[PDB]
Design a protein around this ligand. Structure first.
Ligand SMILES: Nc1ncnc2c1ncn2[C@@H]1O[C@H](COP(=O)(O)OP(=O)(O)OP(=O)(O)O)[C@@H](O)[C@H]1O
Ligand SMILES: [Mg+2]
Ligand SMILES: [Mg+2]
Lengths: 335, 246, 94, 212, 233, 134, 99, 198
DNA sequence: ATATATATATATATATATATATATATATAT
DNA sequence: ATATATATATATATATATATATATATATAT
């Protein structure tokens, strides 16, 4: 979203380890003081003046300072790389010792920076988790948690770089050695290099080309070209959508049966599906009988259980009307 | 925020449907009809408009869901008629923009039942234009005709304000559809597309898909590259140590 | 020191991502995406996206705004970090 | 005895030809690909059976040759059973520049990873800008359209060299590459401290380099 | 290097565990069949916790295994996984694949689906021990969880003004009873998700829109006739 | 060994007379769920008939094996498909057990309403039965 | 009908042909602790009332296994139902399944 | 180790030339007596040797041998143009029965050119040369040159044996049947060939 | 400026080898 | 005269390697 913000704005136009140690010590002291103040507790104003004004600003500023020191170390890394590159241009075989030395001091400085970083990373993390624990003493301390979540990453982030840089440098270092072991070993006097340069400059005075094997490619049979189906389809366009309505007759019947049946649950009277169905089906014509029976059963089985079902004695198929309709159900007793 | 919504789904010249537009519902749309009515065809049209990859589209019966039947046919070719077919989804964005995404499908002539799909998108179309009419030409006495992609492009470009785009790849299609809030995830890779299709296919057949429940890790937890870089660093260290030992 | 509107917006986006980046490292694979987004927002196409991104990144690197480190495994085979001058210019407004 | 490999083929040659790596390696070699130390598996395979494979390829009237730098390749003879081809003059220029960058310490910070832009900058630095453009187009006089054309030609030649194994694109990036020792062949005309016109004659006699 | 790998794996595992467990509270007791709820069970696996501890503390004791020219890095990791924790009894799969699996942090979390079936507590949801409708409900719950996760993970790339469309299908919705379908409808309405369901019968007569399709053979071809259905008349 | 079996000399296919088209090979993906279910049940009844005819020569002359088949999730079929299934099974004297989640209400046969419940802290299926309607 | 534990696999209707996914065959959970029975009653063409069946039992142990013992009863009177043979009507509320 | 008969086949002094010509896509018919006999004798092993390259050594029903690359071919593959396939089918047609009285096994470039013009559709001819062309001298000259180029390309494959001289007059081999269509009971070869070409 | 050829990666289905668990007949301790 | 342990056969399903088809990027040539 910041792109529009920038567009409307319309704007345009110290590697010493003793330092890092002293900032780390200051940070540890201040963090411990803030953590203890938070742990002791206080009112909203005390919580503020002890965990939001002192902690926030100080930790932010000094972590930014430590990151700035790391950035300065990165700048020194770049400059030493450039110095090695320039030195190898002027002495060639005689700069090997100089380049190896420079690599040695840079590597030692990186390792010392990592050591100083890890000299206090663990304790700072412990104090930060302590502040996390003590933060919950009030409901308005939400912002504190953010710092206790932010100042984590930065710290860890810092430590990460302290290793990553070495991981990078230990790589670059190797390459340089490889270069000396590969580029200059076979060009000790560099004469091959100057002579190649002049050949490049004066190549077209004797244009020559190398020879390479150029075996033939295995010609293949082209697959048949794919032709789609075209028929200019035409047809009647649909009319406006019609509509149909759903019959709620079954809803009315179900409500009727539910009202007729709730009395059994109210009175806890033993319900017998046989007799109830036989009585109730007499009120409807034969074709509807099924659609009644089902519904009635659905309403009856929600009302308690039948205790006889655990007796192991099967129930009989009681007739519930003429024409041969039957029902199998024990009396419903336990409501 | 007001979530975007699928307003309708249009099938032109499908098996049974010549030109039919179902107006989907904000919450639930139900399709009813006896066996062989054409409901699964409607969902097939929708899915094809959504994920037009022909490596994925496989319309097995609801029975044998995921079970290899050895049919050799994905079941899409039979659902289309000869000629040009369309399948378009009309979507109202969170920004209140009516965007008509879709595909043009068309059978390939020959014994093999192979289909050809070309996606496309339409932006800025007026709310008074229905996709059923936009894709057909009234030729004859109430006897409209289906017009191909080139004619559709000519017809749309002649209109004012409408932007018609045709995509040379499915990746660009999905990128545009994600930019306009029609897909949750950005399907940059083929695996992302496969996972999206797995999700919609699992919903279509309903319930616990074997493929999903076997990779719930790949579907829920995100990929992390820090762990992979750390493993590469350890691998390099081990390689150097092995070199020295040898 | 010469930051047109597009370069300044790209630098600010880089700073924001670095602030929200986990471990404070930026591979060029994300720098290209950020430049793509800023250029898309500014609505100008002088050349391809890739060439513009590469030219801007190189200009800032030589203008002492970014530091580059060659790491093959990293996405894009390079890792970029804001330089102190770049940090100052970015945080002057942020 | 009969039904015995030694009747027709040496045991080690048969083992080499039956190795899982042989077919792809052979196809790549016949395609013109040079093999460097980077291809650890293929390079070691060639090293182990260098003589067996050399005698096998001799049957095609082509020499499997290992340059002193340690990279193998194929040099067809005039009677080659496998066709032969010559690099373009622009390819020779770009290969010489790549060898220079391999030997150049100024680019040490790159750590071997180079972009086509840097290659073109070095090319124009060491070559004659407009007169090099002349080959790109006969009617160029510094026009920026011809400038882009020369850039595209350099990119195409870089891709071709990648096909020859002189250069590797990075596992994920096609806009960056790492040079390989094979490029040293582009300097074979100057590795010996003699008169250029005599070394050129020696090379052309040996089959290394035809003229244009 | 091994210590760093183990530490980063542990940090990522903890972060994902917390995210998933927080997400779990986004479900509100779906009533599908006898299944009364659905939940995600994420837990760091002990068989992999031991491996992480070994990588973090005792790398040098197993160097007989890592620097063997026969075993690659993935195979070496697989063999180390076999070495300690020998009761797991992995199957016919090769060491290479089971090592390439070990190089992925997600495999360090057991990530299962639990269902609160009836009154037996939260049980691992296995299709062999669930009704068809119960399994359909559980699967749809998992799918909506996946969609929510995808949408949340893209909240950064997307603009602040676009919320993506949500839609899912259900073919053969007649396999669900009235209670399950009502639960699905309410769950989707809560999640702002659209559903397209198919069933031979008007299984949802009083919600959303409904169409009825009738296929007619007509002069040696087939034509489908669509008519809307309304709740009341 | 395959050649020694006469069945391997025979090519068998299932064909369906679908709509306005002629007889087509029965492909699972080229059919709807209901059509596939019907075709499967037809093939199953054929297989049962074939087995009974094969074994009749090795049974008592007056033994007619019982025939029964299931159909789970029968709600996937519409009313017409279910009617056709019942007619086909009645013609062949085959018994059917169909499971429907209350969606269908076939009027002919026996019907069993099941309802799961908790009783005495144990799960219990209250079952009621009807028959004879129609 | 088919008391074979190799074939009996009561997978879910969805995933009708899909692979196992798990290792359980789905039968153990459908049973209860004790002695279970599954009996078919059949009337032949000869009009013999044959009661075929199996006795099922959760094999106590680490896994979820079952033990099936088939049996057949011939000549039963038509006035005795299968639920009367297998349950003793003790004086308690609920009957007792006998092994 | 290696199969013994495979080693015998590889060691044979004919193997290098034949291998180069196969990897170049050339078709070895009955005319090449030595090569055809070698392939006949050692097919059972050369099929495996060339399957190691993800290629298939195929003996056509007519008898001629060739190499068919798979999708995973380790030998750099290539595809013939559309004009190439048209000319191949034209030559397959000209491998006719009336051919005996027409040209006695020796054809000339003019026959192929006239057959291609008369038989093919104009749109495909323009697609070959260029779309905007319409019955012009320069377009026809370019078409004739491209016809000669594709004839040379086919010669590389062994489909057409040039009569040795700079002039373009050649003979057609049986391997050309690769371009041909399948033969059914009672079908006229000319009619089916023309139906395929159309 | 765009059609076309080419290389690479992924999903999907086939076919084969193999370990697991169950059923059946026999052997041998109880 | 019995029940448990063995050997055999079988189906299940698990995993790998192969081959195919599709999508993609992109590098050439008119
Ligand atoms: N690939 C195909 N090829 C040929 N016919 C097809 C194909 N797919 C579907 N059909 C036919 O289209 C018609 C509709 O089938 P469809 O799958 O849409 O049904 P449905 O609505 O899912 O029905 P059901 O409720 O039975 O599942 C049926 O005649 C079916 O045979
Ligand atoms: Mg269906
Ligand atoms: Mg069920």
């Amino acid at each position: 979203e910041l792109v529009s913000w920038a567009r409307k704005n319309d704007f345009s136009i110290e590697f010493s380890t003793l330092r890092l140690s002293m900032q780390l010590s200051i940070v540890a002291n201040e963090l411990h003081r803030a953590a203890e103040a938070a742990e002791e507790g206080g009112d909203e104003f005390h919580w503020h003046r002890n965990v939001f004004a002192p902690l926030k600003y100080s930790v932010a500023e000094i972590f930014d300072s430590i990151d700035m020191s790391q950035r300065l170390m990165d700048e020194q890394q770049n400059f030493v790389k450039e110095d090695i590159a320039a030195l190898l241009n002027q002495d060639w075989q005689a700069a090997i010792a100089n380049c190896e030395q420079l690599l040695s001091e840079t590597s030692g400085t990186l390792r010392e920076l990592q050591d100083t970083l890890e000299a206090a990373g663990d304790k700072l993390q412990a104090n930060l988790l302590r502040i996390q624990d003590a933060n919950m003493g009030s409901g308005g301390s939400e912002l504190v948690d953010k710092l206790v979540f932010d100042l984590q990453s930065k710290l860890d982030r810092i430590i990460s770089w302290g290793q990553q840089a070495i991981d990078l440098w230990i790589g670059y270092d190797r390459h340089v050695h490889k270069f000396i072991r590969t580029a200059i070993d076979m060009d000790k006097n560099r004469i091959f290099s100057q002579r190649l340069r002049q050949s490049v400059q004066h190549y077209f005075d004797n244009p020559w080309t190398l020879t390479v094997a150029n075996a033939e490619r295995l010609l293949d049979m082209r697959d048949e070209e794919l032709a789609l189906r075209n028929e200019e389809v035409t047809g009647e366009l649909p009319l406006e959508l019609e509509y149909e309505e759903f019959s709620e007759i079954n809803d009315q019947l179900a409500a009727m049966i539910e009202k007729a049946l709730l009395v059994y649950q109210q009175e806890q009277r033993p319900l017998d599906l046989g007799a109830v169905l036989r009585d109730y089906l007499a009120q409807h014509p034969l074709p509807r009988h099924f659609d009644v029976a089902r519904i009635l059963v659905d309403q009856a089985v929600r009302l308690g259980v039948a205790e006889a079902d655990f007796s192991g004695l099967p129930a009989e198929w009681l007739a519930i009307n003429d024409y041969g309709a039957k029902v199998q159900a024990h009396v419903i007793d336990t409501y | 925020i007001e979530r975007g919504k699928f307003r309708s789904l249009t099938l032109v010249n499908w098996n049974g449907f010549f030109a039919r537009t179902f107006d989907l519902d904000e919450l639930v749309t139900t399709l009813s009809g006896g066996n062989g009515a054409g409901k699964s065809t409607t969902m097939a049209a929708f899915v094809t408009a959504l994920i037009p990859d022909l490596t994925l589209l496989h319309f097995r019966n609801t029975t044998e869901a995921g079970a290899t039947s050895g049919s050799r046919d994905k079941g899409l070719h039979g659902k289309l008629r000869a000629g040009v077919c369309y399948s378009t989804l009309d979507v109202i964005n969170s920004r209140h923009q009516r965007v008509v995404v879709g595909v043009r499908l068309q059978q390939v002539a020959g014994r093999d039942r192979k289909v050809d799909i070309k996606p496309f998108m339409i932006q800025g179309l007026p709310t008074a234009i229905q996709p059923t009419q936009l894709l057909t030409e009234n030729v004859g006495e109430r006897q409209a005709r289906v017009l191909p992609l080139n004619e559709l492009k000519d017809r749309l470009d002649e209109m004012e304000g409408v932007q018609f785009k045709q995509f040379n790849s499915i990746t660009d299609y999905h990128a545009q559809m994600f930019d306009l809030g029609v897909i949750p995830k950005r399907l940059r890779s083929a695996s992302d597309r496969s996972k999206f299709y797995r999700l919609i296919e699992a919903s279509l057949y309903g319930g616990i898909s074997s493929a999903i429940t076997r990779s719930l890790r790949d579907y829920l937890l995100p990929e992390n590259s820090g762990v992979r870089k750390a493993f590469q660093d350890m691998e390099a260290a081990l390689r150097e140590n092995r070199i020295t030992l040898e | 020191i010469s930051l047109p509107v597009e370069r300044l917006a790209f630098l600010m986006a880089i700073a924001v991502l670095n602030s929200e980046r986990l471990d404070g490292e930026m591979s060029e694979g994300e720098l290209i995406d950020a430049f793509r987004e800023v250029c898309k927002g500014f609505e100008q196409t002088a050349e391809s996206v890739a060439v513009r991104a590469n030219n801007a990144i190189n200009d800032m690197v030589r203008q002492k705004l970014l530091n580059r480190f060659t790491s093959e495994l990293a996405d894009g085979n390079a890792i970029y970090r804001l330089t102190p001058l770049g940090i100052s210019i970015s945080d002057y407004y942020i | 005895s009969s039904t015995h490999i030694e009747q027709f083929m040496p045991v080690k040659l048969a083992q080499a030809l039956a190795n899982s790596l042989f077919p792809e390696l052979d196809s790549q070699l016949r395609a013109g690909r040079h093999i460097g130390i980077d291809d650890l598996d293929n390079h070691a395979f060639l090293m182990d059976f260098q003589e067996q494979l050399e005698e096998f390829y001799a049957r095609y009237n082509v020499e499997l040759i290992r340059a002193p730098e340690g990279f193998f390749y194929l040099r067809p003879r005039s009677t080659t059973l496998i066709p032969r081809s010559v690099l373009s003059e622009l390819d020779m220029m770009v290969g010489k520049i790549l060898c220079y960058l391999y030997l150049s310490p100024e680019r040490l910070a790159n750590q071997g990873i180079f972009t086509s832009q840097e290659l073109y900058e070095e090319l124009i630095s060491l070559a004659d800008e407009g007169k090099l453009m002349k080959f790109v187009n006969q009617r160029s006089s510094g026009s920026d359209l011809d400038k882009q054309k020369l850039q595209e030609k350099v990119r195409t030649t870089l891709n071709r060299l990648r096909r020859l194994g002189m250069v590797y694109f990075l596992p994920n990036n096609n806009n960056k590459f790492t040079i390989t020792e094979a490029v040293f062949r582009f300097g074979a005309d100057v590795r010996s401290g003699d008169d250029p016109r005599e070394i050129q004659l020696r090379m052309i006699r040996d089959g290394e380099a035809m003229p244009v | 290097s091994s210590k760093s790998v183990a530490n980063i794996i542990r940090k990522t595992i903890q972060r994902e565990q917390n995210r998933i467990r927080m997400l779990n509270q986004g479900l509100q007791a779906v009533s599908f069949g006898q299944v009364r709820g659905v939940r995600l069970n994420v837990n760091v696996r002990e068989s992999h916790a031991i491996l992480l501890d070994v990588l973090s503390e005792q790398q040098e004791q197993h160097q007989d295994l890592f620097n063997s020219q026969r075993l690659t890095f993935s195979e070496a990791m697989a063999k180390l996984y076999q070495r300690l924790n020998p009761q797991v009894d992995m199957g016919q799969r090769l060491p290479q694949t089971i090592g390439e699996e070990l190089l992925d942090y997600r495999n360090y979390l057991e990530l299962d689906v639990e269902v609160n079936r009836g009154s037996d507590g939260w049980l691992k949801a296995e299709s062999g021990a669930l009704s068809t409708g119960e399994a359909i409900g559980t699967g749809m719950s998992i799918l909506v969880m996946v969609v929510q996760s995808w949408e949340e993970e893209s909240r950064r790339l997307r603009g602040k003004d676009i919320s993506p469309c949500r839609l899912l299908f259900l073919d053969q919705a007649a396999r669900l009873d009235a209670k399950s379908i009502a639960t699905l409808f309410e769950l989707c309405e809560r999640l702002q998700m659209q559903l397209i369901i198919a069933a031979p019968e008007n299984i949802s007569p009083e919600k959303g829109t409904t169409y009825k399709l009738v296929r007619k053979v007509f002069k040696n071809h087939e034509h489908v006739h669509v008519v809307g259905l309304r709740g009341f008349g």
